[PDB]
Amino acid sequence: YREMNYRHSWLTPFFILVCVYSAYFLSGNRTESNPLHMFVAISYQVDGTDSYAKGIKDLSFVFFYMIFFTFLREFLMDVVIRPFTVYLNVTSEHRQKRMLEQMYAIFYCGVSGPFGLYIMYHSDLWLFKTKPMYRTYPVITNPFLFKIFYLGQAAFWAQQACVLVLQLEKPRKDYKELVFHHIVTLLLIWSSYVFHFTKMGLAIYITMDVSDFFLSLSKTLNYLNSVFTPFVFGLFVFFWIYLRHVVNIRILWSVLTEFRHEGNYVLNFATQQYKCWISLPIVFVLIAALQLVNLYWLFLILRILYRLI
Amino acid sequence: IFNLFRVCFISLLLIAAVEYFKYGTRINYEWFHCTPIKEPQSGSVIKLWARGGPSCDKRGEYKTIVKRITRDYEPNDEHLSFCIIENDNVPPVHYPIHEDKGEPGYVAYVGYDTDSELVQELCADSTIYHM
Amino acid sequence: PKIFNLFRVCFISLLLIAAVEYFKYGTRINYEWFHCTPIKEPQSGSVIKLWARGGPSCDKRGEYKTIVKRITRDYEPNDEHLSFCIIENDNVPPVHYPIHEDKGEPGYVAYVGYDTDSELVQELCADSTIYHM
Amino acid sequence: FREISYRHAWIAPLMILIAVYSAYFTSGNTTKTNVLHRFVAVSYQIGDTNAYGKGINDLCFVFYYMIFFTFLREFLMDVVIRPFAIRLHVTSKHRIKRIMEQMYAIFYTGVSGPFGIYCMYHSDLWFFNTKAMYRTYPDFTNPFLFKVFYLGQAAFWAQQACILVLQLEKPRKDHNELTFHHIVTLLLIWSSYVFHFTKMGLPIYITMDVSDFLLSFSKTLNYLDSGLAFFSFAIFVVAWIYLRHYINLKILWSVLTQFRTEGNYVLNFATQQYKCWISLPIVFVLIGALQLVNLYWLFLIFRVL
Ligand SMILES: CCCCCCCCCCCCCCCCCC(=O)OC[C@H](COP(=O)(O)OCCN)OC(=O)CCCCCCCCCCCCCCCCC
Ligand SMILES: CCCCCCCCCCCCCCCCCC(=O)OC[C@H](COP(=O)(O)OCCN)OC(=O)CCCCCCCCCCCCCCCCC
Ligand SMILES: CCCCCCCCCCCCCCCCCC(=O)OC[C@H](COP(=O)(O)OCCN)OC(=O)CCCCCCCCCCCCCCCCC
Ligand SMILES: CCCCCCCCCCCCCCCCCC(=O)OC[C@H](COP(=O)(O)OCCN)OC(=O)CCCCCCCCCCCCCCCCC
Ligand SMILES: [N+]
Ligand SMILES: [N+]
Numbered sequence: 001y002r003e004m005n006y007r008h009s010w011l012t013p014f015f016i017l018v019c020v021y022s023a024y025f026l027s028g029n030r031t032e033s034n035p036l037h038m039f040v041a042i043s044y045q046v047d048g049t050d051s052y053a054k055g056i057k058d059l060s061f062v063f064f065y066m067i068f069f070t071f072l073r074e075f076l077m078d079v080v081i082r083p084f085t086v087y088l089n090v091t092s093e094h095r096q097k098r099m100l101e102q103m104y105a106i107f108y109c110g111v112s113g114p115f116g117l118y119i120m121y122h123s124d125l126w127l128f129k130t131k132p133m134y135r136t137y138p139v140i141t142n143p144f145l146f147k148i149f150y151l152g153q154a155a156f157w158a159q160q161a162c163v164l165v166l167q168l169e170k171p172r173k174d175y176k177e178l179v180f181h182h183i184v185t186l187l188l189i190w191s192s193y194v195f196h197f198t199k200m201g202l203a204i205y206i207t208m209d210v211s212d213f214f215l216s217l218s219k220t221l222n223y224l225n226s227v228f229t230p231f232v233f234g235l236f237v238f239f240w241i242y243l244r245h246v247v248n249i250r251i252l253w254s255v256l257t258e259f260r261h262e263g264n265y266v267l268n269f270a271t272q273q274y275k276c277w278i279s280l281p282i283v284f285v286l287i288a289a290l291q292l293v294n295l296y297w298l299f300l301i302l303r304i305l306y307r308l309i
Numbered sequence: 310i311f312n313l314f315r316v317c318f319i320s321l322l323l324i325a326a327v328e329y330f331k332y333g334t335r336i337n338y339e340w341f342h343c344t345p346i347k348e349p350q351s352g353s354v355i356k357l358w359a360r361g362g363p364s365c366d367k368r369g370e371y372k373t374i375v376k377r378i379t380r381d382y383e384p385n386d387e388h389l390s391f392c393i394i395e396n397d398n399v400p401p402v403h404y405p406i407h408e409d410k411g412e413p414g415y416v417a418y419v420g421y422d423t424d425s426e427l428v429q430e431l432c433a434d435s436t437i438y439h440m
Numbered sequence: 441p442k443i444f445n446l447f448r449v450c451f452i453s454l455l456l457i458a459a460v461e462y463f464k465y466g467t468r469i470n471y472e473w474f475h476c477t478p479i480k481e482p483q484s485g486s487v488i489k490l491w492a493r494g495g496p497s498c499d500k501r502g503e504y505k506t507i508v509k510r511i512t513r514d515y516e517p518n519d520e521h522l523s524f525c526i527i528e529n530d531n532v533p534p535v536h537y538p539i540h541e542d543k544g545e546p547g548y549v550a551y552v553g554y555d556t557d558s559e560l561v562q563e564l565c566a567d568s569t570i571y572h573m
Numbered sequence: 574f575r576e577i578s579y580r581h582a583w584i585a586p587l588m589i590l591i592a593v594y595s596a597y598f599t600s601g602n603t604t605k606t607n608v609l610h611r612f613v614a615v616s617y618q619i620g621d622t623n624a625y626g627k628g629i630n631d632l633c634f635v636f637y638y639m640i641f642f643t644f645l646r647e648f649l650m651d652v653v654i655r656p657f658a659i660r661l662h663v664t665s666k667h668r669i670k671r672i673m674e675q676m677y678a679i680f681y682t683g684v685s686g687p688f689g690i691y692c693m694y695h696s697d698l699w700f701f702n703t704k705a706m707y708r709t710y711p712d713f714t715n716p717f718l719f720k721v722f723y724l725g726q727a728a729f730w731a732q733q734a735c736i737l738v739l740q741l742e743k744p745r746k747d748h749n750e751l752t753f754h755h756i757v758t759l760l761l762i763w764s765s766y767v768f769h770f771t772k773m774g775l776p777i778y779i780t781m782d783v784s785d786f787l788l789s790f791s792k793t794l795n796y797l798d799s800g801l802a803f804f805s806f807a808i809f810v811v812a813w814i815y816l817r818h819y820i821n822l823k824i825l826w827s828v829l830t831q832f833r834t835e836g837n838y839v840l841n842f843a844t845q846q847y848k849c850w851i852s853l854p855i856v857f858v859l860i861g862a863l864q865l866v867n868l869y870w871l872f873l874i875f876r877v878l
Contacts (some may be wrong), residue, residue, distance in 0.1 A: 442738075442739045442740055443739060445738055445739065445740075446735055446738050446739045449734070449735070449738050450735070453731075453759075454632075457632070457763060457767070460764075460767055460768075461767065464767065464768075464845060467842040468842050468843060468845060470842075471841070471842035471843040474840075474842050475840075475841070475842065475843070495839060495840075496839050496841070497839060497840060497841040497842070497843060497846075499843060501843075502843070539839065
């Protein structure tokens with residue numbers, strides 16, 4: 001086992017997952033009453049309706065699926081994509097390892113992205129509709145998929161932040177940006193969920209996920225050598241500008257012109273109604289800060305685009 | 310390891326910190342939304358009601374009224390008498406956002422028992438509650 | 441720095457001095473949480489008979505605060521409007537509860553229920569004042 | 574100027590002392606309404622009675638007299654004690670440094686004990702009456718002397734603890750021992766006031782001060798070579814035995830017995846009635862921990878014997 005544990009780092013998390021899942025299903029009840037339902041499923045379903053509330057068990061779901069992604073992270077590394085990079089014959093320790101970091105970015109950005117769209121497609125937020133972000137606020141309970149999405153992203157980015165802080169590998173020169181990306185992404189995921197801004201945050205998360213998918217895919221081919229690298233990078237600027245700037249600006253503008261006019265705007269702590277004149281500067285500052293960071297990144301992409309030409 | 314533990318602990322404290330803010334504000338909301346207003350009548354007797362916006366609902370006024378009744382008077386120093394008179398003419402949510410409020414949804418007359426007779430006059434037909 | 445070590449003790453000490461002053465203040469304004477046990481006696485779908493139990497420190501004020509705390513927390517008027525009454529046991533003084541378990545009648549009982557059972561809360565209140573939330 | 578501020582370290586806190594007194598006295602207010610009253614005098618007096626409540630102005634009084642005790646400490650050493658050592662012909666500079674704190678110790682406990690027994694005498698706590706420690710509990714207000722004593726005593730030990738914390742002279746063999754004593758006395762002073770146990774803390778403190786006074790007087794006579802040292806130290810063992818052990822043990826027994834019999838034993842946070850079955854172990858172990866220290870310290874005195 002120990003020899004397998006080292007060579008196949010995913011073994012240890014894999015054992016936990018199969019045990020807990022087996023124990024949960026072997027219990028028979030497989031319902032909210034199961035202590036293992038605390039972890040393997042999302043809790044606080046509103047009776048039998050498709051809406052789940054928030055509470056302590058959410059962290060149990062997040063913590064357990066940090067282990068799940070730890071397996072998936074390491075499993076896809078050892079069994080799937082690392083052989084692929086050898087199949088591509090990168091033949092470079094640093095170049096290959098970085099190409100792994102980006103290849104894994106394809107798997108999860110290429111899954112969560114389409115998942116966020118599938119969630120948002122099955123919602124009234126379709127096509128970044130900013131009015132629905134606020135009409136139903138506070139959204140104290142979430143559909144099955146949005147809770148799966150938010151906690152799944154919280155579970156995913158918690159694991160990524162967890163491994164990053166462990167520093168299992170010697171930090172690279174860009175380690176600071178990775179820390180900021182993970183800590184800021186976690187903070188946005190957690191703040192939006194805890195403060196019932198899930199509808200607003202799903203749109204913002206989709207933009208940050210979808211653009212990243214093309215970033216890593218574009219970057220992956222740059223590590224490689226193909227005629228598709230400029231084509232995908234060209235696709236990336238279109239999606240980056242549209243999603244990180246056009247969509248996020250429209251979301252920013254709504255925080256100034258639909259935070260007030262859509263839904264309730266009177267602060268009411270009794271009813272968890274935090275959308276008010278006090279939260280507007282905070283939401284605007286947070287989203288604007290994200291856009292300011294995006295503009296800085298846009299500067300990089302634009303100067304790296306001139307270097308491309 | 311330990312560094313991660315610290316990151317997890319501080320993050321979980323932030324989670325718990327925000328949770329209590331949501332819980333405490335949701336539970337003590339009348340503190341943020343209902344401003345207690347006093348009208349000293351005579352001796353220890355006062356007229357007591359809460360003012361505020363839409364979030365200062367009848368429940369919030371009652372909680373705000375009860376808070377000062379049960380905090381501005383010490384029964385263990387001297388026994389007190391009070392009455393809380395509901396305003397049948399307003400709904401539980403009556404207070405508007407702006408400052409031109411109407412009649413309060415709840416009013417209370419509370420005074421130490423040396424002033425008991427006075428509270429009864431101001432309470433009129435309303436039940437007298439003793440603490 | 442030595443001067444830094446002075447401020448960290450003068451900060452740790454004042455913290456301690458205030459933590460205790462918050463403890464002695466917080467427990468004194470929230471004394472009913474320590475001394476009064478809310479005893480809920482369900483009566484119907486939303487109506488419950490509500491009173492508090494405790495020792496001599498469970499003042500009549502403590503019961504009233506305890507009963508109000510539950511009326512205003514166990515029922516959400518924004519989900520559905522709330523009706524209740526508080527009935528004083530004028531046959532006992534404000535300090536009535538013995539230390540032992542043979543408490544006797546409470547100093548305050550409240551019948552509280554959602555407006556769906558408002559007619560039913562009215563019946564149990566027995567011509568007491570009916571308060572709406 | 575800095576030369577005088579160095580040769581006379583008591584110049585530094587005499588300025589604030591003179592400013593506040595002169596500023597306080599010159600102003601025509603001189604009552605609780607004046608801004609400086611919360612620093613210069615006892616606050617929270619109730620009516621014309623002698624009983625004073627507690628509150629934050631008791632922390633502005635402590636802090637202000639921490640300056641006074643920082644003036645009193647350095648002034649007396651830099652005016653009377655240090656010349657006293659020089660005029661006594663002490664042959665060792667290290668001994669001179671040690672006799673500074675004891676000679677100051679003889680002073681401050683030599684006036685604190687007399688003040689403390691004065692407070693107790695003018696109180697029904699006289700003869701170390703353990704009944705009075707509990708009949709009137711909680712004691713939310715204190716006589717003028719009591720509040721001056723405790724808030725003055727907490728100021729005094731807070732400056733002594735502070736000076737030790739900033740390590741004016743780092744090297745000291747018993748620095749850890751002093752740091753513990755200074756912290757403990759400032760915890761028992763605070764804890765007993767803030768929790769209305771001033772009456773029970775007064776005798777415990779008086780035993781500490783009266784014994785400390787003869788310990789210091791004996792110790793100085795040890796440094797100051799004299800035959801009187803042993804006779805004075807003999808009076809210390811008997812005084813230490815009676816005060817640190819007989820009185821403190823009696824207080825411990827009252828904690829076991831009279832803490833549950835006299836006064837209200839029903840916990841009541843509404844009335845701050847902390848004398849109950851919960852505070853009993855806290856009060857016992859705190860005094861018991863104090864006694865165990867005195868038991869250890871008695872063994873050291875017997876070792877000296
Ligand atoms: C990178 C993405 C990789 C792929 C991610 C998605 C994979 C899905 C499968 C993963 C393994 C778990 C499989 C199922 C475990 C047990 C689930 C279960 O019991 O049923 C679903 C559960 C509740 O269902 P039930 O108990 O039936 O109650 C409701 C109906 N009565 O409720 C649940 O559905 C709980 C379990 C959900 C499992 C997935 C949660 C995370 C997915 C989030 C999206 C992807 C996150 C990636 C982030 C990268 C982007 C930066
Ligand atoms: C960075 C490394 C990893 C760090 C952690 C992972 C990052 C997390 C990212 C965000 C993911 C979700 C986090 C939030 C989930 C739980 C908090 C929550 O939403 O609580 C809300 C709930 C109240 O529900 P609500 O609908 O808001 O109003 C009342 C309902 N009528 O609240 C409540 O009623 C309960 C409040 C809970 C208070 C406790 C706070 C947490 C303390 C630690 C508990 C740990 C035990 C459980 C988890 C085990 C695994 C760690
Ligand atoms: C020995 C060290 C260890 C400690 C042992 C315990 C004893 C010492 C305690 C600390 C020093 C004294 C602190 C408190 C003294 C002042 C108390 C006070 O409130 O002053 C009363 C005085 C009269 O006016 P007042 O009573 O305020 O007005 C009527 C309403 N009460 O109020 C006023 O109007 C005047 C304001 C007060 C001015 C005080 C001036 C003090 C000058 C030096 C005092 C020295 C104390 C020690 C004695 C030996 C010194 C060598
Ligand atoms: C260096 C000192 C500080 C200098 C700056 C002065 C301002 C500091 C402000 C920050 C700290 C504030 C802490 C909280 C203050 C207390 C608040 C208050 O008003 O509490 C009330 C309470 C009395 O309660 P009571 O009124 O009897 O009860 C109600 C009626 N039943 O009141 C009390 O019981 C509180 C009594 C406080 C005084 C304690 C006396 C002993 C002090 C021991 C010395 C501490 C020295 C610390 C620094 C050196 C440490 C080595
Ligand atoms: N307020
Ligand atoms: N309790």
